[PDB]
Design a protein around this ligand. Structure first.
Ligand code: HEM
Ligand SMILES: *[C@@H]1O[C@H](CO)[C@@H](O[C@@H]2O[C@H](CO)[C@@H](O)[C@H](O)[C@H]2NC(C)=O)[C@H](O)[C@H]1NC(C)=O
Ligand code: NAG
Ligand code: NAG
Ligand code: NAG
Ligand code: CA
Length: 595
């Protein structure tokens, strides 16, 4: 294709690579190519994009237009027929805690965000897309099949706006459309600090030379910090309980208040920041603000990388972990650390892990109050349940002692997300994330299931019998064939997630390959990887090796009983130990001296 590089922002670079700290945007991580892995650039394409028209139109757009000689089925039709289930009994993952699902969503948010069009500044259209369901331009409505009960009750469609794309915003041709990753591709705590200099400074507390992140000024959690409120209008966290008028939180990533356990996880991370900036000052009273903030933020980034790579990834990828992510051998500047477009769909395996309810537990890990257990859908954009209904301790206890949902070929996504999703500005608890993932897959120009099977070196089933054997499920392969007509045409989100899970893992072979390749790249390709010689000292690394999610909980909450392995399914009190017994992070090794 030989051609030069376009880009939405300026590849305006000011590197001068002597500082020991990461930039906010990700620029300057790679010396030879300073934009690589930086926020607000195109997602990487591991395979060329496939659109209806070769350029920008998703499959499904022109109803005459086939993919490989067949019409693509409606995203909501696939949803109802394949992804849906009624019976929440028996659905829980007997060996993953709810926190395993939660960490997944955290790591995701650190790595990719491809926001719907007009990532811009403020107050834009007054949308007819929701109004009349007329497809056009960036409005790509998810239409209901007849028989869809939502037709009786919600009208003809669900709103869906196409994702923004680089060399921008309204019209373009002859290079295929590329979607934007709005956050840093590096696993770098960008969800805590921001990926733009503008949000990064606003989250900081600069009124005191202490290098602290700003905390809520209206509310405290038994003397401990909350995230600042976001004073932006309109607020969906206000929209959900007008009486309570509790806004969303302000965090390094804009989605932090999407559900209460994510806002919870963000609250712990920030707490850890300030706990970190406080300790460094004790050991180095000479150190200035900017210093304390960088060194804390750098320790926090290391904790997220290690928790993700040491604890999470091996229990996602199972026997495939070593295959795609071998033990580390230093920084390789030849590796592309950019998040691919496909990964952004691959990592949506988490949707199948979200159970239908969230609980609050007390000190004895028994139900907290009379409405301890809540249906997940009442907890989208919900921060009042945190501020006015007990702080984060009871929710953190539930993360520890309640379980993730297990993926299940006959019970894929809970109705709490499949039929009751709330999206900002759309006023009801009646959306379907599954249909959204599938409309999005098409929006982003995804190659189909077999192109990805091919990329990963796996067989590419062409018939029903071949697909039944790959899925090890006769009836599911038959439902897919009936909708799709060929396995060439199955959207990657639903084809990857349909494969049975690998041994000791929670995704199948195809996803383990896509996820595995991405993660290995974000580690090997990151100049600031905690274990890269030079980034930390030998003593600091020995100290950082003792971090666990159990110890983070202990330090930043009033919980005194934690399990040693927080991602496994744990029951109180057998698997729970005193906080005192858990390894501490030791900042002694960060002591430095002048005069
Ligand atoms: C109750 C919990 C969750 C809710 C309410 C939720 C909701 C959403 C929504 C509304 C989107 C945007 C869909 C679009 O417009 O295409 C999204 C995308 C996404 N989700 Fe979740 N989700 C949850 C849990 C998870 C989990 C557990 C994971 C991973 C383990 C996950 C990973 C992802 C990723 C990677 C994306 C794409 C981000 C991007 O690149 O744009 N989510 N989710
Ligand atoms: C909106 O939030 C308020 C809390 O601010 C909820 O009202 C509370 O409900 C229980 C009922 O016994 C009481 O303990 C509180 O005193 C109520 N608080 C106030 C300030 O009125 C209310 O349930 C929420 N409403 C909805 C629809 O979600
Ligand atoms: C900033 O830090 C000061 C000094 O410790 C603290 O008292 C104040 O509440 C903080 N302000 C914000 C907005 O976090
Ligand atoms: C629970 O999962 C962990 C990691 O996946 C594994 O090491 C352990 O054996 C599991 N427990 C059981 C009973 O399978
Ligand atoms: C660096 O990555 C490239 C491309 O992925 C690979 O070919 C090469 O073997 C890696 N470097 C080393 C030293 O292994
Ligand atoms: Ca990041």
């Amino acid at each position: 294709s030989w051609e030069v590089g376009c880009g939405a922002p300026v590849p305006l670079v000011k590197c001068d690579e002597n500082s020991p700290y990461r930039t906010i945007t990700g620029d300057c991580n790679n010396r030879r190519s300073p934009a690589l892995g930086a926020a607000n650039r195109a997602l990487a394409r591991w395979l060329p994009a496939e659109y209806e028209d070769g350029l920008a139109l998703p499959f499904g757009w022109t109803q005459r237009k086939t993919r490989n000689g067949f019409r693509v089925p409606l995203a909501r039709e696939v949803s109802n027929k394949i992804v849906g289930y009624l019976d929440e009994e028996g659905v829980l993952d007997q060996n993953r805690s709810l926190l395993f699902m939660q960490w997944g969503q955290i790591v995701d948010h650190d790595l990719d965000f491809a926001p719907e069009t007009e990532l811009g500044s403020n107050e834009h259209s007054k949308t007819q897309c929701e109004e009349y369901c007329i497809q056009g331009d960036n409005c790509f409505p998810i239409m209901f099949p007849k028989n869809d009960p939502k037709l009786k009750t919600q009208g003809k469609c669900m709103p869906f706006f196409r994702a923004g794309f680089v060399c921008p915003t309204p019209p373009y041709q002859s290079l295929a459309r590329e979607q934007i990753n709005a956050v840093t591709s590096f696993l770098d705590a960008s969800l805590v600090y921001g990926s733009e200099p503008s949000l990064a400074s606003r989250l900081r507390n600069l009124s005191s030379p202490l290098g602290l992140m700003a905390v809520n000024q209206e509310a405290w959690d038994h003397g401990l910090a909350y995230l600042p409120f976001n004073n932006k209008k309109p607020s969906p966290c206000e929209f959900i309980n007008t009486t309570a008028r509790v806004p969303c939180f302000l965090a390094g990533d804009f989605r932090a208040s999407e559900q209460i356990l994510l806002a919870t996880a963000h609250t712990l991370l920030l707490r850890e920041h300030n706990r970190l900036a406080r300790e460094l000052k004790k050991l180095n009273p000479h150190w200035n603000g900017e210093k304390l903030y960088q060194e804390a933020r750098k320790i926090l980034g290391a904790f997220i990388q290690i928790i993700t790579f040491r604890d999470y990834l091996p229990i996602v990828l199972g026997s495939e972990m070593q295959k795609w992510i071998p033990p580390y051998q230093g920084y390789n500047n030849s590796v592309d650390p950019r998040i691919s477009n496909v990964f952004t769909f691959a990592f949506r395996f988490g949707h199948m892990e979200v159970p239908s309810t969230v609980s609050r537990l007390d000190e004895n890990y028994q139900p907290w109050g009379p409405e301890a257990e809540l249906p997940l859908h009442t907890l989208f954009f919900n921060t009042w349940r945190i501020i006015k209904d007990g702080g984060i301790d009871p929710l953190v206890r539930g993360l520890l002692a309640k379980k993730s949902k297990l993926m299940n070929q006959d019970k894929m996504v809970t109705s709490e997300l499949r039929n009751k999703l709330f999206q900002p500005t759309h006023k009801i608890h009646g959306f379907d994330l599954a249909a959204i993932n599938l409309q999005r897959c098409r929006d982003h120009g995804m190659p189909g299931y077999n192109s990805w099977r091919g990329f990963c070196g796996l067989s590419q089933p062409k018939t029903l019998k071949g697909l039944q054997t790959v899925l090890k499920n006769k009836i599911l392969a038959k439902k897919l064939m009936d909708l799709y007509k060929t396995p060439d045409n199955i959207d990657i989100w639903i084809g990857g997630n349909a494969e049975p899970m690998v041994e000791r893992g929670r995704v199948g072979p195809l996803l383990a390959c896509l996820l595995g390749r991405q993660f290995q790249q974000i580690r090997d390709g990151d100049r600031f990887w905690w274990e890269n010689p030079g980034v930390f000292t030998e003593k600091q690394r020995d100290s950082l090796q003792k971090v666990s999610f159990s110890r983070l909980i202990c330090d930043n909450t009033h919980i005194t009983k934690v399990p040693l392995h927080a991602f496994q399914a744990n029951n109180y009190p057998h698997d729970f130990v005193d906080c005192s017994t858990v390894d501490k992070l030791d900042l002694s090794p960060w002591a430095s001296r002048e005069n």
